[PDB]
């Protein structure tokens, strides 16, 4: 008669690594790294992303006429932009402090666009002739829909002195621009006056832009340039504009209704008609694992990102052959 002490064995082929020994077969193990995703861009807890498609943030916000889809967009969970959107600045130029503005959108879930300076309001200047073949719409010359490229009227561009008071409760994002023409002949042909400026003031802003004349390479058939600027107008503050010419005036500006957790995600993927708790640029994650290795840039309630190919904890003991 005998009694023996022993231990469990089973048919498991799960393996775990140790410092001293790789690929040790164990009776029980627990994977802790999520390796799969659904390959789609999805709503984040029921809230759909803003998918800019072929538009850039600039094309969107300025109102590039190829970006009408994103006129008055609803609340978003996150934004998705392609690596090189084709519909950016249809008329060539620069967007001033563009990256700082993008950073600002990482903290915004909703804009509500409003008209601050009506287009009909311009009784002394031509407000409907500021269009270019570089910004076409349905076969015709058009322009950024949210700003008005003002030009002379009966060979006079008289000084502009306008104000908008931010009466509403919500911080207001205001865009304007300046036009840099090719030469002295084009300056007088559009704005009459040879030497011009645009002065812009708020409680914090003290700006005075002057057009910069130079012969440039053609981009989209245009050698002139448009330089766009912005500020955040606080509630109960006012912005004043003064200009001789070259002024690309606000018409519509954006009301910052909802602030919160957002991100500008960079991806070529389109909408995948789905919902998820955790989104990455390559697809959505649905797991209970503490770790994943899909992509570092995630949004939502996500596992922690590691560069590992494999993370498996031993729970059981060394399985017998």
């Amino acid at each position: 008669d005998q009694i023996c002490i022993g231990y469990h064995a089973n048919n498991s082929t799960e393996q775990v690594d140790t410092i001293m020994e790789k690929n040790v077969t164990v009776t029980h193990a627990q994977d802790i790294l999520e390796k799969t995703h659904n390959g789609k861009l999805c709503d984040l807890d029921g809230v759909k992303p803003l998918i800019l498609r072929d538009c850039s943030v600039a094309g969107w916000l300025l109102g590039n006429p190829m970006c009408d889809e994103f006129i008055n967009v609803p609340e978003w969970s996150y934004i998705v932009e392609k690596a090189n959107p084709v519909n950016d600045l249809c008329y060539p130029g620069d967007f001033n402090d563009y990256e700082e503005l993008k950073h600002l959108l990482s903290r915004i879930n909703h804009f509500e666009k409003i008209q601050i300076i009506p287009k009909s309001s311009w009784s002394s200047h031509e407000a409907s002739l500021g269009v270019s073949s570089a910004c076409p719409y349905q076969g015709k010359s058009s322009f950024f829909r949210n700003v008005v490229w003002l030009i002379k009227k009966n060979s006079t561009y008289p000084t502009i002195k306008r104000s908008y008071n931010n009466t509403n409760q919500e911080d207001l994002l205001v865009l304007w621009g300046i036009h840099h023409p090719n030469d002295a002949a084009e300056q007088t042909k559009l704005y009459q006056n040879p030497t011009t400026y645009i002065s812009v003031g708020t409680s914090t802003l003290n700006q005075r832009l002057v057009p910069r004349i130079a012969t440039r390479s053609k981009v989209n058939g245009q050698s002139g340039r448009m330089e766009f600027f912005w500020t955040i107008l606080k509630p109960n503050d006012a912005i004043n504009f003064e200009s001789n010419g070259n002024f690309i005036a606000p018409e519509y500006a954006y009301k910052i209704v909802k602030k919160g957790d957002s991100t500008i995600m960079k991806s070529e993927l389109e909408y995948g008609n789905c919902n998820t708790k955790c989104q990455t640029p390559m697809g959505a994650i649905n797991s209970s694992m503490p770790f994943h290795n899909i992509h570092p840039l995630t949004i939502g309630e996500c596992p922690k990102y590691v560069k590992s190919n494999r993370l498996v904890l031993a729970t059981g003991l060394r399985n017998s052959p």
């Binding site: 008669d1 005998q2 009694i3 023996c4 002490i5 022993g6 231990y7 469990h8 064995a9 089973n10 048919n11 009776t27 059981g316 003991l317 060394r318 399985n319 017998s320 052959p321």
Partner: peptide
């Protein structure tokens, strides 16, 4: 020194725990 040591291997036959006993009598 026990597992895969002085105890050569595990028991496929012990299903209800990690460690235990095996007896043998008449």
């Amino acid at each position: 020194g026990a597992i895969a040591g002085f105890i050569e291997g595990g028991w496929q036959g012990m299903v209800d725990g990690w460690y235990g006993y095996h007896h043998s009598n008449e």
